[PDB]
């Protein structure tokens, strides 16, 4: 019987390439377009990933759709932060091996306003020295971080699944053997970072929603992202979101 965290580890998505032509000069519009197209492919891989998370496919099909639609940006910002934290201790965003947002790219007009929210995530993972096992538990928890204000169809089963992954995070913390009081502080710190992802995501979504709606910017979004954004905009307008928190 393999451990739950080992089942989350084996389903880690493959690293995707942007297909970014480095011989042509850079621009924020060019990079933003390429990253949106790459983002759609990341989200298609995220559906495959979520379907293999133990318990996820036992939820009502509508709840599966709901959870991926609320959490999409949280998953993407967190997975990006981890990849950026692993490649370097520098201020780099590793979106793809062929498309890294370096210091030169960060100075491109308007590049930083969106990239800073992503930089915060990698900065925090580096500051807290988050482990691979802690990260895997945390990323599954982000998929389960928001629900509709009237709840899910399989709400009882969801609460059971969420509790199981909270317990898995606790087990990952204990493995990094420190005194009982230090493990209490670590759980507090990592769950505080999880809570702060709602604000990181709110900032990313504010800019993302505006960019998608303003057709005069000519910023293309692939079908996968356009569909998620089209679904999510009216949900935020009608207050149809309950952001789950560990602290208050």
């Amino acid at each position: 019987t393999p451990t739950l965290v080992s089942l989350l580890e084996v389903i880690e998505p493959e690293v995707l390439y942007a297909g970014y032509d480095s011989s042509v000069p850079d621009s924020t519009w060019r990079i933003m377009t390429t990253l949106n197209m790459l983002g759609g492919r990341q989200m298609i891989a995220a559906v495959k990933w979520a379907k293999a998370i133990p318990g996820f496919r036992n939820l009502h099909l509508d709840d599966q759709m709901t959870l991926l639609q609320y959490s999409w940006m949280s998953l993407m910002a967190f997975a990006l932060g981890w990849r950026s934290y692993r490649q370097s201790s520098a201020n780099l965003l590793c979106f793809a091996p062929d498309l890294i947002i370096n210091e030169q790219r960060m100075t491109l007009p308007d590049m930083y306003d969106q990239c800073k929210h992503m930089l915060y995530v990698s900065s925090e993972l580096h500051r807290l020295q988050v482990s691979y096992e802690e990260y895997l538990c945390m990323k599954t928890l982000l998929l389960l971080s928001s629900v509709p204000k009237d709840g899910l169809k399989s709400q009882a089963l969801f609460d059971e699944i969420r509790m199981t992954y909270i317990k898995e995070l606790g087990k990952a913390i204990v493995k990094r053997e420190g005194n009982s009081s230090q493990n209490s502080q670590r759980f507090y710190q990592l769950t505080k970072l999880l809570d702060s992802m709602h604000e990181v995501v709110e900032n990313l979504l504010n800019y993302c929603f505006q960019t998608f709606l303003d057709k005069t910017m000519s910023i293309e979004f692939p079908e996968m992202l356009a569909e998620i954004i089209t679904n999510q905009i009216p949900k935020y307008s009608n207050g149809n979101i309950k952001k789950l928190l560990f602290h208050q």
């Binding site: 298609i44 559906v47 495959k48 099909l61 599966q64 759709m65 639609q69 569909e227 679904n231």
Partner: peptide, 13 residues
């Protein structure tokens, strides 16, 4: 409504 997402969840991987 959310045609693509529904297709990806319902199809066999």
């Amino acid at each position: 409504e959310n045609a693509l997402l529904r297709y990806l969840l319902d199809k066999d991987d």
